[PDB]
Amino acid sequence: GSSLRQKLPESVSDVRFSSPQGQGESRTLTDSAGPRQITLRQFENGVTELQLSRPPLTSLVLSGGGAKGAAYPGAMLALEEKGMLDGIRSMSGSSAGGITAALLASGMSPAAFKTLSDKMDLISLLDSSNKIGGFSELLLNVLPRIDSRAEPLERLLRDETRKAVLGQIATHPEVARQPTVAAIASRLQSGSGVTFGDLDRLSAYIPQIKTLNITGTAMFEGRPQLVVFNASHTPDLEVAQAAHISGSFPGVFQKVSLGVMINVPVPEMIDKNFDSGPLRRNDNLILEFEQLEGLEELREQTVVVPTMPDEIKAHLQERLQERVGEHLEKRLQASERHTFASLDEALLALDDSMLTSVAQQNPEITDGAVAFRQKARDAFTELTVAIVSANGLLKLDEAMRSALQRLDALADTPERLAWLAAELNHADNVDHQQLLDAMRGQTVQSPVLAAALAEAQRRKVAVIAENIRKEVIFPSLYRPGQPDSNVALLRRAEEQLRHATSPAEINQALNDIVDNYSARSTTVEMAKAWRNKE
């Protein structure tokens, strides 16, 4: 449990390295295998070292502030220029960049976007010539109420987005014919704006449509609050509405009844996800103005660009172009290292593709691992046929037992049992989840199922903790008046919460706060409220 910062002596007998560390000469088991250049080195004492190309660029995080979003098309060009704009599957922006990523997710081609930003850098500057639950669902519920429907910004975005999305639909007439798509474009042509729900729904068909996450931080009661608009929380709300709402510098709370601050801290946009193993699944290009994903690893993924005329804005679309150009080729020559305590552990860390690559190249190494993977993938289907045919009529019939028996047989080391449990936890997999939800709290014959169930509850507990961090801590932690004493307490509650494995530990987090926070009331209430609810 690591340490974060920013007379003769009687002998100590024999001492190992608590982590795995290669000792002695290494042989190379597999050199550069596959698209992701898998290298395996193995040492005299077993320890296997994995080296592998940086993950695929699948995400774009756009940080807000200022008005300077006339530089933004610099990058956009740099992306299609080197041709990895296709490869993006997600876009995330706050404040001023909140609008920009809207435009882009909507499917606005690189050249298309620019001309708009050259009549936008007027508008973005003229809007600066203008200038229980939480403060999230009480926004999520205040929208349909007393808010002026469509402004100059809402209209313009509504249309920009609606053009891109509708345009892509046509270039791809193979998808246009699919019911659900043709349902969406008849909505769009009726005058409706693009939602997240469908930006999402369209990114599965066409790869030039991207998902959207717009983050923003609203002051209430001196206490900044995180607010998220994305496919999951605000699915049918319109992309235009949100990007404008998060245009609101500090914004009015309608007075509804019962470094600096404009920054949403970078890591509050990047997503928490449960990867089956120690491998990161993707990379972020983080554009900024002026598996704890650390400062140091985030720096590595962040390029930071250094009354506006029309030629200085070009300059800025060149400086950016060029930095976001060197990065992308450099990032192509850098790596990831992961150290394991055994070969099989490191073959477990690879997805089936990667495994298959190493296998092509050096089959002597992997035959065991491919054998195991094959049997697991079989047993997991076999188990799914069971779950489904049981709905035909909860009760673990024999067929599930048999497949759980087949899985139990594969878990002949602690490493593989862990892998088999995680595999059975994929939130995405409705049928497996169907079964874990059912055996929740139960004692089961099968070890694998027993693992999987425990793993499930750990996750349940982690989201609860994460929710509390976001709504009891985050607001206090960044209250401007906050005496350092108070900050110390909460920076500690965060630590407690990070490592919380059981509801009881979560309770203790909150009590530490109730017992020790000096109103020097609300945070304390807030906490009390979390402590009593299930």
Binding site: S3, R5, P9, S18, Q21, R492, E494
Partner: protein, 121 residues
């Protein structure tokens, strides 16, 4: 000189060495050693500071830092996460095997003395 301190357990400072090594002896606390400008930082973890400590315990904690303590030069502190830590600082040049062996022992002595003061709270 660190590498010869290691050497006595048949361990060797690992190639491509980065930030943090962690040694776990057969008895007693894990030893975390970061690496610095021109020296290593040994550290031992004692858990998160407990709520509701009695004064006397607080005192015995603070008293670990008197320039005259029996544990010198080991210091007691908390990191930013509120984790109670004993640490010392081994410099290249200055220190050597016998000396590092001392730091280590003073850390284990400090850890055994204090560790029961927190738990029972």
């Amino acid at each position: 000189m660190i590498d010869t301190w290691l050497a006595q357990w048949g361990l060797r400072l690992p190639s491509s060495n980065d930030a943090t090594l962690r040694l776990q002896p057969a008895e007693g606390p894990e030893l975390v050693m970061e690496r610095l400008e021109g020296g290593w930082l040994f550290v031992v973890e004692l858990g998160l500071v407990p709520s509701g400590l009695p004064l006397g315990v607080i005192l015995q904690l603070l008293q670990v830092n008197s320039p005259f303590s029996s544990l010198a030069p080991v210091k007691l502190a908390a990191d930013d996460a509120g984790r109670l830590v004993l640490w010392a600082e081994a410099r290249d040049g200055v220190d050597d095997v016998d000396a590092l062996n001392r730091l280590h022992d003073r850390l284990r002595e400090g850890h055994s003395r204090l560790v029961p003061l927190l738990e029972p709270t």
